[PDB]
Structures are given as structure tokens and as C-alpha cells.
């Protein structure tokens, strides 16, 4: 009869800026108002770009983890000394300039979305593959991959904690703590 | 009478103006054979703070609550394992510096006592009124009527202002005894 | 309420104290919801207290970086300091993601807890007579599970 | 509930009760489980012969732990010999079907209709249509019969057969 | 345009307009200061979830227009000259083809 109460934080009210977007309201969960001072467009840019980076950095983690290498004995490092041992070696270089220049055109559609330029939706590329025809199942759709982004950054995040604090695999079942 | 934060928070924020009343209506001050508006250095005059002030003696003495039942509990009972055996940490007190730092336990529960706070900081300075002053929609056992609440209001005061006394005791008597939970010499 | 199910037959209305002689539906509401949630838990610990001891064992290792299996744990009011505290730490967040989710109502029934584990609307008398035998079962399990546990505290265990 | 699909020979809405009250969600919802196991029992009871007489047992299952797809011992001594990783895998895998694909329980679908253009059936109009559909039923409840026979004789003797 | 929904009022109600908001914001007082750079300070008048950005207003191209300043110009072709006559010294010390 109120206020539109936050699903997720019972005890505030829901921002006005998570009305109408993917996740949002189901949740609503933004109890330090991060929404209330940045734009909620440029912040679920960001929020997409992480999840799909931690998506696909988790998934990484496990199969270097796990023992899965490419054919060269230059490889033949554990997860943690990967990323300096290829700093050294050469492609992470080579990584950064692709992702450079992936991150352009990226920039440019950010640029060109909240200018009003394009109709962009702010983690739309265009990939439309394996997405529902239904606009609810759109919709879905997009919840499921922003809780999956969500899963797979805290999930990366504890991974290389663990990892680093206990030099062990990735289950980091044996472990001693 | 507990109207829900939902509509409460209509009317809250800094207010401007008076009730008349001890501290702007605020439960606390009723005591055994009558009234016993307390306040005798006049904080309660700066009434714009009295919502304030209120959420800070209900938090205080909401941790004063669990902390003398936490010095109570270790005295008889420990969490299984080594690090928190009886005689590695022999009494209670010494715990903020056994454990704690790079060990670990304590350092954990500083980081999620901070993301708790930082997420329900809103609710203390916007949100904060003299009707929604340490509510947090948590009502369970409430009572309906609004003169049991008032009871249950001036329970947990009563409760939570002992506590922060008691717990000031406990400390005190443990640190100049190193004894269990009768902290008697 | 004298017809919110609960009475059966051996018993009316089984209120000596009068706890609910107020007409708080708020109250009751709460009471009838903690009842069945009740019967419902201690109806699996019943089930937990008797099968550990004479079958059932569960055949892998509770903890294999402690080797400890579960046959070694022994079986009731001592158990608590043989699984692992993370273990129960699980088995709280667990019944956690059960009980405040999954199975978290409100405005619905008494304790129609949604999700539940299929999703099944019945209809008819027979949901009333099965709806009060569930409660009646509760109330056994109840009765039941307070006797195994505090007998155990007072006898050790076993036979 | 007496002339829906089941309704073969030599038995006619076969009651043992269970079936009155007229409750039209429950024989939705109970024929879905029965088809349910069937679309389960087939496939249970056709894994439980094939790898015996065809003996495929085609390359390994589990590379790093060797397991060779040829020496993991048929019937109920299975489950022990593939590793948990692949169990879990096989069952988390089902469960994208069951709640992604194929398996999308709309309620305006038919009790075991959904999505189907991957294998199952796809036909249209009744008359051969619904002599498939009983084909079906008939079908799983002989297999429903049949998988948990294979499992007793298997955890009985010694082995599947 | 950034305010289409805030109930804005002047001064002269402040205790006279209540009509909160498509949200239940209370209405704002908006008071016109003088300052170009603060032209309208607005006053809140209770509790309210406003969305006020604190990130500043900028476009591509104005940026470029800022951009193409006879110093940004003249310092980036600058730069990249002084760049380049390092790049061409390390790749050809001591000028031997000379
Ligand atoms: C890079 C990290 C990152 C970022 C930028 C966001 C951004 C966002 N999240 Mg989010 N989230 C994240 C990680 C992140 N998330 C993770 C790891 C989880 C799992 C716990 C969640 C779980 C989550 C929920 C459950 C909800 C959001 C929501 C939101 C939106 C509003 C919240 C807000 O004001 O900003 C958040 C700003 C930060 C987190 C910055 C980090 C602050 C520190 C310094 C916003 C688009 C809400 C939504 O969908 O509405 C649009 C919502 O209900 N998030
Ligand atoms: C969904 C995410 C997720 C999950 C499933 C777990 C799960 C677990 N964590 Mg973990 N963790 C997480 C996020 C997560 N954590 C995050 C975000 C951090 C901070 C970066 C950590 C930091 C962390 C530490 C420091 C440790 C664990 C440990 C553990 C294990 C106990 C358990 C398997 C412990 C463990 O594996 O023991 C070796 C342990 O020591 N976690
Ligand atoms: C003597 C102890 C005591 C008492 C009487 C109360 C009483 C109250 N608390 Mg409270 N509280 C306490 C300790 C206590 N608290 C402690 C130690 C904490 C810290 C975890 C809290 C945290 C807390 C929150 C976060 C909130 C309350 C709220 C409330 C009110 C409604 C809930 C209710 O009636 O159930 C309590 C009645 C009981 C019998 C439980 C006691 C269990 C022993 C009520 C006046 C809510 C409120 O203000 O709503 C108006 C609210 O949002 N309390
Ligand atoms: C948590 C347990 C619990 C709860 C919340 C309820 C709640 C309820 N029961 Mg119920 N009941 C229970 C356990 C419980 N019961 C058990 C174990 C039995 C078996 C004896 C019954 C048998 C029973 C019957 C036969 C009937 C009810 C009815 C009712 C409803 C109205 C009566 C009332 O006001 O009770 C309020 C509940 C309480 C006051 C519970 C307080 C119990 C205290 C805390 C302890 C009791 C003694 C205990 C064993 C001491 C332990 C010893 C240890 C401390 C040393 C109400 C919703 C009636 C009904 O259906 O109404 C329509 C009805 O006819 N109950
Ligand atoms: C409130 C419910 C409850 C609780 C807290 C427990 C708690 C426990 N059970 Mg248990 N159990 C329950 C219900 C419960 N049970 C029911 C309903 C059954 C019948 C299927 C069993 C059958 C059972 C067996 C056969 C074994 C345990 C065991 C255990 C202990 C090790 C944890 C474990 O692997 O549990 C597993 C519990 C489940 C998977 C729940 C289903 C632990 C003390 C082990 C033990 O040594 O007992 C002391 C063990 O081998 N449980
Ligand atoms: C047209 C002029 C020019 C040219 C042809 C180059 C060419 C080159 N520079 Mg260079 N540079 C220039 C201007 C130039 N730079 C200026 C103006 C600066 C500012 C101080 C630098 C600072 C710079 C650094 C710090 C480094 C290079 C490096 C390099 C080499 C690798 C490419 C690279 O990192 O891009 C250079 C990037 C830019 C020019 C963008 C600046 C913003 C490459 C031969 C790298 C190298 O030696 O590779 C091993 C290296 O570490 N340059
Ligand atoms: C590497 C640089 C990365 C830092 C900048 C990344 C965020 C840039 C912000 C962005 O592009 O959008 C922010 C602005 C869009 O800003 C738009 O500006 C409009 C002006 O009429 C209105 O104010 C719109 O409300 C506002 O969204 O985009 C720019 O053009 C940025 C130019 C590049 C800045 C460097
Ligand atoms: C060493 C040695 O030689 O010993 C051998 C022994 C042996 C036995 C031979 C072995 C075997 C073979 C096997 C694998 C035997 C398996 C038996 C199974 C799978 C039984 C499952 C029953 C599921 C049921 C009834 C689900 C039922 C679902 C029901 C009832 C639903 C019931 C509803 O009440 C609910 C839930 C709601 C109601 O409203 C409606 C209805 C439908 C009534 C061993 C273990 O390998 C080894
Ligand atoms: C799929 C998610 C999942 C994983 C991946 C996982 C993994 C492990 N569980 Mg867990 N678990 C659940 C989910 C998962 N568990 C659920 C839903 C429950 C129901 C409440 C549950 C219960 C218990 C109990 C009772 C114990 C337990 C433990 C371990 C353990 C051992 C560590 C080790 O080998 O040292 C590991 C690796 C035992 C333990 O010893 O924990 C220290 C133990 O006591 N678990
Ligand atoms: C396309 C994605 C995909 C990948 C990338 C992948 C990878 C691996 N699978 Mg898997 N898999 C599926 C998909 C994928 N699997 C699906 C849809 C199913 C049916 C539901 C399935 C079933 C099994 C089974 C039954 C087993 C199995 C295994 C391994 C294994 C071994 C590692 C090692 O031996 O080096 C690796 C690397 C074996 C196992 O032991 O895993 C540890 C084993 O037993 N898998
Ligand atoms: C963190 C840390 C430690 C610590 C600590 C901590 C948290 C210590 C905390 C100490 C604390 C919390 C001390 C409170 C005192 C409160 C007092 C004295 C109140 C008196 C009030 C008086 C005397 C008067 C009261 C009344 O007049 C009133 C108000 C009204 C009258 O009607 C009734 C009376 C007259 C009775 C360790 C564990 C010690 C060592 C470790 O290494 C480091």
C-alpha cells in the first residue's frame, strides 16, 4: 500500500532504477543504493561483462586445474604461475590485444547506447542463439545467464582465494585448515 | 499500532518539529511505579536526533544481548575443534586475541558484520523515524495490541539497556579475574 | 477454531490452558504453522533415530580426509561431536535453503508450503482425513523423538 | 478416468482403488508419472540386455582412471565401477532436460506432451496417433514391469542374468 | 528531462502541495540559485529513494570537440612526433647507414 518494498531486503524500498530490467524485479536487492547514484544501464553493462568474464575465467580455472593443457611444454605450469608464466612467455600479450580491440567495439557500443544513438539493451551484443521466442522466455533467459554471471563470479572469486591460500587443485577437497 | 516500513517510511526523516511528549513519544521511559523520563543532561532535547538515538541504544543493546550471553556460553560450551578448545583459549576474554588477525575466525566475522551494517545503513540515516527507529521488519513474536507492543517495546529496552550495563561488568570482572562465567574472585 | 483440523477423535478440541481461547488467527496462524513444521521434523528424526542402529548405514566415508565414515559416528545424543562441525554446518544451510526457500509461504494455508517435494493440489475429504493424519503422525513423532532423545541422555545408548 | 488411453485387453481401467474421487489434476499428473517411467523403463530395460548380447562396450569412459567402457560390470554392480564424476554428470545432464528441454512441464500441454521435435514423436490428428500413444503406455509398463525384474534377478544372484 | 517524475514545486507551497510522486517520493522544493554552475538546488521535504546521479553529463562530441583544441591537436602530433624519433633511435642507434 506503500512504498514497491525490495523483495530481497525487505526493510527498504526497492530503487526506482531496477523497475523493468532482467533480474531486479524479483530481488530488487540493492540495499546500498549503488543504483540510486549510477546509471542502471552502465551498471548492468558492467555486471553482464563480469559474470561472462568470470564465467568463462571459472571454467578455465577447473580444466587447467584439472590437468587439460595445450601440446606444448611451455604449458607445463600450475593455475597460479599460468599467468605470469605466459606474461613471460608471450600470449597473454597477444590476449590483451585481442581483447583490446574486442573492448573498442565494446566501448563504442557503450558510447553509442547511452547516447541514444542505437536502441542497444545494455548487455546486448546480437548473439541470438538458443534465446527463447517468447518474450517471457526472453526474459527468463536473461535471469538465468545474470544468475549464472552472479554464481560464477563469487565461485571464481573463492576459487583463487583457496587456491592461493592452500596450493592444491581445484576441489580443494583434501586441503588442511 | 506498528505501521509497516512499507507505509511507515511515508513519514519518515529528519523531523523538524515537536511532540511534546518526554522523547518525542518514544518508548523507554515508563517504568515500575510510573513514569521515569530519564534524560537528565538533555540529550533528548535535540529532538531531531531522538530517532537517532534510539536505533543507537537498541543496537547497543541488541549486541550487548548476544555479548553477555557470549561470554557466558564458551565458559560451558566450545565449538568442535582445537582452535577453540578449552585449553588452547582456557577462558572466554582471551579470544579477541587468540583468535583474531591472520588466524582468521575473528577477522571473518568483522568483514560480514561490516557488509550487514553497510547494507542496513540506509535504514539508520534515511528511513529513520521516530515510528520505524530499530525496526527491521522483523516482527514474529510481536503482539498485536498496541499496549502489549508497547510491552514487548520496553522488554527488550529494559533487557538491552541491562545488558550493555552487564556486559561492561563481565569484561571488567573477567579481565581483573581470568575466572569462568561467576566472574566473582 | 474447533474445526481447523487436529481433531480427530480419541480428543476434541485439546486445549486445557486455553492458549488459543482468544480467536487470534494471527496467533494461531503461527501456532498451526510451528505445529506441523514440528511434526514434520521430528517425523524424520524418529525416522533418523531408529534406522542408523538397526540398518541402513550409509555404505561411503562421512569425512574421507578424516577417514571417518559413517558407520564409526555412533547413532544418537553424542553424534554431535562426531560429525564434523562443517558438516553441520550443511546440514543447517541446507534446511535453511528448505525452509526459508523452497518451502517459504505466506497468505496461503497453514503450512502449505508451495513446492511439495512435487507440486500437488488434492481435493476432496480425503485430503482432510490425510491432512489430519499427518498431524496426528506429528504429534506422535513429537511425543516420540523427545523420549528417544532424553531417554538416550539417561541410558547411553543403544539397547 | 475409465476411457483415456489406457484402456488395452485383458484388463479395462484396472482399479485397485486409486483411481475415484474424480480428481482430473491426479490422473494428469499420475499418468504423466506412469509415462514418465516408461520413457524410462524402455531405455532402463534396453541398457540392462544390449550391453550383454551386443556387447558394444565401445572405447573408455574414464581416461584419467582408466574405467574402460568394456570392463565395467554389467546390471547393478555398475553403479560403483563409472565414476561419480560421470553419475553426476549423466544426472545433472537429465536435469537440463527435465527443466530446459523436452522436458517442459507447461501446464496447457498435455500429460506428457511438450516439445518433441527431438526423437520421441511428432505426429499429428488421433486414430494411429492415439494406437501409437496406447503403443506407448503398453509398452512402458511392460518395461516398468520388466527393469525392476532385471534388478531383483541382478542384486539376487550375482550379476544381471 | 532527468526529473520527468519528481512532483517538483516552488517554494511558495512548500506546505501546500503533497501529491508525493509515481513513486512515493514526497514532492521536492526547487529553489532557482543564481550560480550558472548550480542554476536549481533541489530541497527534499522527507524520506525519499531519489535517483541522483553523481556521475557527470559528458558526450562523444563534445569530448572530441575538446579533443580537437589547437593544444590537444598540436600536443598529440607533438607527441607522437618526439615518440616516433625515440622509436626510430632505439631501432637505429648511432645512425651507421649514415
Ligand atoms: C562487478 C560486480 C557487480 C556489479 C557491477 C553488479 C551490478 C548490479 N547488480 Mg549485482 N551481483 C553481483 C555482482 C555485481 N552486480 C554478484 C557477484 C552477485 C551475487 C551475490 C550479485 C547479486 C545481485 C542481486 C541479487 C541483485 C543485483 C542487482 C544489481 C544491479 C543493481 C545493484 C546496484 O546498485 O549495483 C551493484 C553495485 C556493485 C555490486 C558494485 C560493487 C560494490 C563494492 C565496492 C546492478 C546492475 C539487482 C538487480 O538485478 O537489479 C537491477 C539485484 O536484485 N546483484
Ligand atoms: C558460490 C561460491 C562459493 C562456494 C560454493 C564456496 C565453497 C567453499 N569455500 Mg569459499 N569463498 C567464496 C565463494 C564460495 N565458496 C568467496 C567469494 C571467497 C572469498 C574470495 C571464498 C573464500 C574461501 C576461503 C578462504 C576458504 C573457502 C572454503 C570453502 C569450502 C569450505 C567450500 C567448498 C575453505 C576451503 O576450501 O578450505 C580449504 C577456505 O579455506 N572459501
Ligand atoms: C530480551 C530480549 C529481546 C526482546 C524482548 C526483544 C523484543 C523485540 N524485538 Mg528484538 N532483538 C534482541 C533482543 C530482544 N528483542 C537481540 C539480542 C537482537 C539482536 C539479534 C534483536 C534484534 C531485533 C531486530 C533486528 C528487530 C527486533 C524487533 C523486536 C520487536 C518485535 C519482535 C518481537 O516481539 O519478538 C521478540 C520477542 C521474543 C520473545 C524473542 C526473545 C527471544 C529470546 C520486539 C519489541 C523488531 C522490531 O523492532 O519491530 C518492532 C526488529 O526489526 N529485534
Ligand atoms: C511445537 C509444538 C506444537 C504446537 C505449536 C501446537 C499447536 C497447536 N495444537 Mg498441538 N500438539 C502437540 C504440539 C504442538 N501443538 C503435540 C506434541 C501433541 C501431542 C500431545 C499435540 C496435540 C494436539 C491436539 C490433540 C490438538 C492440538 C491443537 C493445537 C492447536 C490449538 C491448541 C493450542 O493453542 O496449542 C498451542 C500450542 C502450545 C501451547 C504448545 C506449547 C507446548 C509447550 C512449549 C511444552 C508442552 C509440554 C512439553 C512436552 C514439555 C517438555 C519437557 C521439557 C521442557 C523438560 C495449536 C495450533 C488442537 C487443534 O487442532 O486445534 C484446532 C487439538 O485438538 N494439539
Ligand atoms: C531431522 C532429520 C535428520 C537429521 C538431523 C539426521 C542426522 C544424521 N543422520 Mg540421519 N536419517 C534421517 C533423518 C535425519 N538424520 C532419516 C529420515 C533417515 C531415514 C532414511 C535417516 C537415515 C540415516 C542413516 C542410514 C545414517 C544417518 C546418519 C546421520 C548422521 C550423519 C549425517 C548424515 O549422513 O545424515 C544423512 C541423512 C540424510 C541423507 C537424510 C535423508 C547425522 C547425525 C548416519 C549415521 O551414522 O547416523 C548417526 C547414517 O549412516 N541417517
Ligand atoms: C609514431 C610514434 C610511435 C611509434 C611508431 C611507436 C612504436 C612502438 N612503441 Mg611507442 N611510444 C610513442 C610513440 C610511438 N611508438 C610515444 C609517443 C610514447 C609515449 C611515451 C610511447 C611509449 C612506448 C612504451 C612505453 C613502449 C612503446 C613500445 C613500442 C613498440 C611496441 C608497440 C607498442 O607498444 O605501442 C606503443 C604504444 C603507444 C605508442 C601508445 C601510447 C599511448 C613499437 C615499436 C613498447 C616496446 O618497446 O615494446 C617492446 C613499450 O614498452 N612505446
Ligand atoms: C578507456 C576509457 C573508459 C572510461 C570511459 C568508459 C565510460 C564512458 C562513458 C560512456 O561512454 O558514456 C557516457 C557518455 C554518454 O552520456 C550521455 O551524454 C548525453 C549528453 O547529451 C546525456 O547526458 C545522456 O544522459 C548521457 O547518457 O558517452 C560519451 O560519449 C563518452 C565519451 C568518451 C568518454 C571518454
Ligand atoms: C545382496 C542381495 O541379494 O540383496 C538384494 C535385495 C534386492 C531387493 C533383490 C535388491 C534389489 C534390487 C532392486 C534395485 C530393487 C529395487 C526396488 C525399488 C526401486 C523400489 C522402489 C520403490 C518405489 C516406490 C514404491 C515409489 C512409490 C511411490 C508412491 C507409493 C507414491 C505414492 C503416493 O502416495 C503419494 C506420494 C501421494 C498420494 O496422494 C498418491 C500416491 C500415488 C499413493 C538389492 C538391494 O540389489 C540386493
Ligand atoms: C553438491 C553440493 C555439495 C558438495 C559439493 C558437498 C561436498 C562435501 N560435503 Mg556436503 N552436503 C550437501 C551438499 C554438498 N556437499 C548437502 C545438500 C547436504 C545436506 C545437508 C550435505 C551434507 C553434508 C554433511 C552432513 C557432511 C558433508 C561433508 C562434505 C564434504 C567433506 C569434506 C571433506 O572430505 O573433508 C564435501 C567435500 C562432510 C564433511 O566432512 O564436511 C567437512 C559432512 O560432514 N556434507
Ligand atoms: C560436452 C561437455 C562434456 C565434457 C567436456 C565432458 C568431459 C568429460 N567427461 Mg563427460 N559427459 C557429458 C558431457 C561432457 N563431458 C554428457 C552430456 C554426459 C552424459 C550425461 C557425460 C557423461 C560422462 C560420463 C559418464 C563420464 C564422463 C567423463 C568425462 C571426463 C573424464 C575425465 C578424465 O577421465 O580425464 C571428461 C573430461 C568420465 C569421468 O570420469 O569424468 C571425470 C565418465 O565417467 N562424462
Ligand atoms: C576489546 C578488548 C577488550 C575489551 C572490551 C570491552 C568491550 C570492554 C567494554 C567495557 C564496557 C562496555 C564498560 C562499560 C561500563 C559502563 C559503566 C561503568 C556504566 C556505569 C553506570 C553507572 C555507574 C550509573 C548508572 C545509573 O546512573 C544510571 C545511568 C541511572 C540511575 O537511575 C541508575 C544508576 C545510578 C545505576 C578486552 C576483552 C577487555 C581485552 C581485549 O584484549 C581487548
Avoid at chain 1, 113 to 125: I, K, L, S, V
Avoid at chain 2, 24 to 40: C, H, I, K, T, W
Avoid at chain 2, 156 to 185: D, S, Y
Avoid at chain 3, 103 to 130: I, W
Wanted: charged share 20%.
Amino acid at each position: 500500500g506503500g512504498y514497491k518494498m525490495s523483495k530481497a531486503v525487505p526493510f527498504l524500498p526497492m530503487s526506482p532504477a531496477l523497475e523493468g530490467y532482467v533480474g531486479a524485479e524479483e530481488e530488487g536487492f540493492d540495499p546500498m543504493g549503488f543504483s540510486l547514484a549510477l546509471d542502471i544501464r552502465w551498471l548492468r553493462e558492467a555486471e553482464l561483462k563480469h559474470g561472462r568474464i568470470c564465467m568463462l575465467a571459472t571454467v578455465g580455472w577447473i580444466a587447467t586445474d584439472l590437468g587439460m593443457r595445450l601440446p606444448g611444454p611451455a604449458y607445463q605450469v600450475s593455475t597460479l604461475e599460468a599467468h605470469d608464466a605466459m606474461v613471460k612467455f608471450g600470449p597473454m600479450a597477444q590476449i590483451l590485444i585481442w581483447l583490446g580491440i574486442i573492448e573498442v567495439f565494446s566501448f563504442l557500443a557503450i558510447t553509442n547506447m547511452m547516447e541514444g544513438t542505437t536502441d542497444r539493451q545494455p548487455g546486448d551484443y546480437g548473439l541470438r542463439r538458443l534465446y527463447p521466442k517468447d518474450e517471457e522466455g526472453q526474459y527468463e533467459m536473461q535471469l538465468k545467464e545474470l544468475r549464472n554471471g552472479r554464481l560464477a563470479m563469487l565461485a571464481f572469486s573463492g576459487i583463487v582465494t583457496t587456491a592461493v591460500l592452500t596450493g592444491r587443485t581445484w576441489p580443494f577437497x583434501x586441503x588442511x585448515x | 499500532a506498528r505501521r509497516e516500513l512499507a507505509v511507515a517510511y511515508e513519514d519518515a526523516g529528519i523531523d523538524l518539529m515537536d511532540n511534546g511528549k518526554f522523547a518525542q513519544g518514544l518508548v523507554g521511559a515508563e517504568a515500575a511505579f510510573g513514569r521515569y523520563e530519564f534524560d537528565p543532561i538533555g540529550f533528548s532535547k535535540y529532538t531531531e536526533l531522538v530517532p537517532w538515538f534510539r536505533e543507537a541504544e537498541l543496537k547497543h543493546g541488541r549486541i550487548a544481548m548476544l555479548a553477555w550471553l557470549g561470554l557466558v556460553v564458551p565458559d560451558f560450551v566450545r565449538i568442535p575443534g582445537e582452535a577453540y578448545s578449552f585449553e588452547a583459549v582456557p577462558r572466554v576474554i582471551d579470544a579477541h586475541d587468540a583468535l583474531n588477525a591472520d588466524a582468521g575466525p575473528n577477522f571473518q566475522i568483522i568483514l560480514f558484520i561490516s557488509i550487514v551494517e553497510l547494507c542496513c545503513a540506509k535504514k539508520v540515516f534515511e528511513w529513520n523515524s521516530v515510528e520505524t527507529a530499530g525496526d527491521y521488519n522483523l516482527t514474529r513474536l510481536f503482539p498485536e495490541d498496541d499496549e502489549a507492543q508497547k510491552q514487548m517495546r520496553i522488554a527488550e529496552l529494559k533487557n538491552g539497556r541491562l545488558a550493555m550495563i552487564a556486559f561492561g561488568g563481565a569484561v571488567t570482572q573477567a579481565v581483573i579475574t581470568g575466572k569462568p562465567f561467576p566472574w566473582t574472585f | 477454531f474447533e474445526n481447523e483440523l487436529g481433531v480427530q477423535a480419541p480428543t476434541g478440541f485439546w486445549d486445557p490452558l486455553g492458549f488459543a481461547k482468544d480467536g487470534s488467527m494471527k496467533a494461531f496462524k503461527r501456532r498451526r504453522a510451528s505445529e506441523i513444521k514440528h511434526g514434520r521434523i521430528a517425523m524424520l528424526a524418529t525416522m533418523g533415530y531408529i534406522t542408523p542402529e538397526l540398518t541402513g548405514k550409509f555404505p561411503g566415508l562421512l569425512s574421507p580426509s578424516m577417514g571417518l565414515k559413517y558407520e564409526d559416528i555412533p547413532n544418537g545424543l553424542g553424534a554431535i561431536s562426531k560429525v564434523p562441525a562443517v558438516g553441520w554446518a550443511q546440514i543447517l544451510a541446507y534446511t535453511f535453503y528448505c525452509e526459508q526457500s523452497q518451502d517459504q509461504s505466506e497468505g496461503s494455508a497453514g503450512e502449505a508450503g508451495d513446492f511439495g517435494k512435487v507440486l500437488t493440489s488434492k481435493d476432496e475429504e480425503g485430503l482432510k482425513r490425510k491432512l489430519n493424519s499427518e498431524l496426528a503422525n506429528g504429534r506422535l513423532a513429537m511425543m516420540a523423538i523427545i523420549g528417544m532423545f532424553f531417554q538416550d541422555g539417561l541410558t547411553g545408548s543403544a539397547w | 478416468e475409465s476411457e483415456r488411453g489406457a484402456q488395452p485387453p485383458f484388463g479395462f481401467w484396472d482399479p485397485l482403488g486409486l483411481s475415484a474421487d474424480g480428481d482430473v489434476a491426479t490422473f494428469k499428473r499420475r499418468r504423466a508419472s506412469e509415462i514418465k517411467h516408461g520413457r524410462i523403463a524402455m531405455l532402463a530395460a534396453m541398457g540392462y540386455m544390449t550391453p550383454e548380447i551386443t556387447g558394444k562396450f565401445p572405447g573408455y569412459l574414464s581416461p584419467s582412471t582408466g574405467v574402460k567402457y568394456a570392463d565395467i560390470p554389467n546390471g547393478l554392480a555398475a553403479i560403483s565401477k563409472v565414476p561419480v564424476v560421470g553419475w553426476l554428470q549423466i544426472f545433472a545432464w537429465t536435469a537440463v532436460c527435465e527443466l530446459w528441454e523436452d522436458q517442459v512441464p507447461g501446464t496447457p500441454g498435455h500429460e506428457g506432451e511438450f516439445c518433441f521435435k527431438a526423437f520421441k514423436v511428432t505426429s499429428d490428428a488421433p486414430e494411429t496417433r492415439e494406437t501409437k500413444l496406447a503403443s506407448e503406455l503398453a509398452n512402458g509398463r511392460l518395461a516398468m514391469m520388466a527393469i525392476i525384474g532385471l534388478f531383483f534377478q541382478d542384486g539376487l544372484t550375482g550379476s544381471a542374468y | 528531462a532527468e526529473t520527468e517524475e519528481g512532483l517538483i514545486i516552488k517554494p511558495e507551497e512548500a506546505g501546500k502541495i503533497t501529491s508525493r510522486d509515481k513513486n512515493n517520493n514526497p514532492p521536492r522544493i526547487v529553489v532557482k540559485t543564481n550560480d550558472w554552475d548550480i542554476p536549481e538546488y533541489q530541497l527534499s521535504t522527507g524520506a525519499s529513494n531519489q535517483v541522483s546521479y553523481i556521475t557527470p553529463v559528458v558526450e562523444s562530441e563534445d569530448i572530441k570537440a575538446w579533443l580537437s583544441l589547437n593544444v590537444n591537436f598540436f600536443s598529440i602530433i607533438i607527441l607522437f612526433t618526439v615518440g616516433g624519433l625515440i622509436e626510430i633511435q632505439r631501432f637505429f642507434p648511432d645512425t651507421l647507414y649514415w
